[PDB]
């Protein structure tokens, strides 16, 4: 669901794709079908100063262009500056998956064979960032 919103926002306003913080190091296996989003972000970053049609026509060789076109119309709003905050919030939510992974693995290791002082300390440090 969130992936559909992210893709729709990315396709609707290709200009904002230049403001995306780097996410190349992140694995695409965490979120479902995240490879399409990362590929779209990299492609849109490669050509700053573009229109929505020229971004849409890029993936005409593949069969996933229909999804991009159907998502672009969806969640369409006239105001431009309003969408930047929503996109930023979605990006922050997506980036929070890394902290989610890190705390989940630490909790799993705690349940498997416990944790030492430093391990629970780093778990606490990671968890403090989740609330804020």
């Amino acid at each position: 669901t969130t992936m559909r919103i992210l893709i729709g926002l990315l396709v609707q306003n290709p200009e904002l794709a230049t403001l995306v913080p780097p996410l190349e190091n992140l694995d695409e296996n965490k979120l479902p079908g995240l490879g399409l989003f990362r590929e779209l972000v990299n492609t849109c970053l490669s050509q700053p100063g573009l229109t929505t049609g020229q971004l849409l026509e890029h993936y005409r060789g593949t069969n996933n262009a229909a999804t991009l076109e159907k998502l672009s119309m969806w969640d369409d709003i006239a105001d431009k500056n309003i969408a930047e905050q929503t996109f930023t919030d979605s990006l922050n939510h997506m980036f929070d998956s890394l902290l989610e992974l890190r705390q989940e693995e630490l909790i799993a290791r705690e349940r498997t064979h416990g944790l030492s002082n430093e391990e629970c300390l780093e778990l606490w440090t990671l968890n403090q960032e989740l609330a804020k």
């Binding site: 669901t1 919103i5 709003i77 309003i82 996109f87 919030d89």
Partner: protein, 448 residues
Amino acid sequence: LKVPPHSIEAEQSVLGGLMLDNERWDDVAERVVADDFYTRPHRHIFTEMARLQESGSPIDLITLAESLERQGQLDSVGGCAYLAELSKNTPSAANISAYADIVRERAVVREMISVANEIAEAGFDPQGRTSEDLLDLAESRVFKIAESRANKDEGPKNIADVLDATVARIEQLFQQPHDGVTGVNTGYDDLNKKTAGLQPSDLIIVAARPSMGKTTFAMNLVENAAMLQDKPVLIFSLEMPSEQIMMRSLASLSRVDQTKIRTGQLDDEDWARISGTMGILLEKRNIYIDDSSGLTPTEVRSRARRIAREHGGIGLIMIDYLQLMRVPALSDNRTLEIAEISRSLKALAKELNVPVVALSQLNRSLEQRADKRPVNSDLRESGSIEQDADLIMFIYRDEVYHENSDLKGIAEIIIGKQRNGPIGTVRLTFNGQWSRFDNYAGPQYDDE
């Protein structure tokens, strides 16, 4: 099966954004209500959020879930898992206003569809109701939906513009050099001075005991307005047929005895005056009369709108009189019926922005007091009438209750209520021979 139009995505987005930002609740609050949500779980969720926010509590996943569980409604809304899904699916509350507007659109469309279906069902099965009843029902149903959308305007937005507009309007009124009367001239110097005429949008109630000439004074004001303006004037003579009202009007205008006109014992000069009055009226054609009895506010409003559209507005409206009007929906409680009638007439006056003189009658307690001069307390079915009444004038005649009165031929118009002006007594000459009121030209009595 034609599914009702709806947008689950907009509702979910609003629900999630409210959990993410309580501050924008106001933006959601003035745009959407609980009943708007197509899905009942969303209705319950919105109700619980409103209850919590009204208490000052923060609208969040945990507090909302526990609040629903306190009423056993959590599992009815999909549970904590569904609430977490709603919280997650919303990225941010920036576009929450658009989502609320979309939800409002869908809800109003479903309401329109429901009203249309009900009207169609009634048409298929009138259950003995005449066509007029069904058409009036459809009128009311459509008008309700039309009025239910008046939520974007009429609010206390940034005052500066409102103050500037009001001051500009005041300056415009000042610049227009009127002769003291800024509204419909009443035809009487003292009454116009104290009232500045019958103002637009204002509800005026003229009252007195029966036989006091209340209808006489009303018709005199109507004639003055018609002669002093070209805009039409509308009369609802529920009390009397149009024939007697027109006979009174001719007697007053011609200053000929009403008895002779009623009896037809008219001489050549009297008939000449009558013919001149008829010619003047036929030249004006700014008067419309309805003698239909039992007229409800709905029919009065519809006919007023018809006349205004056909003639570009109405200068004045006249109703004879309030207590005769019918509201079957409130027939059980007479007081509630009268309050509804008065409020509807006030609303109609504001909408058409025209003076509306609706006549009224007093309780008998007045005549049980030592002083028989009417006051505000004396109105019958009284409480709501005075509240909706913007101007209140009572008609008194000491000669009526005192044969040896020195005020024979004199009538007291007591302005008892005036929002933007002084209250007090005025005197007029009453020619019951002609059923007319005239400016008082005797010695001026100082009002103590």
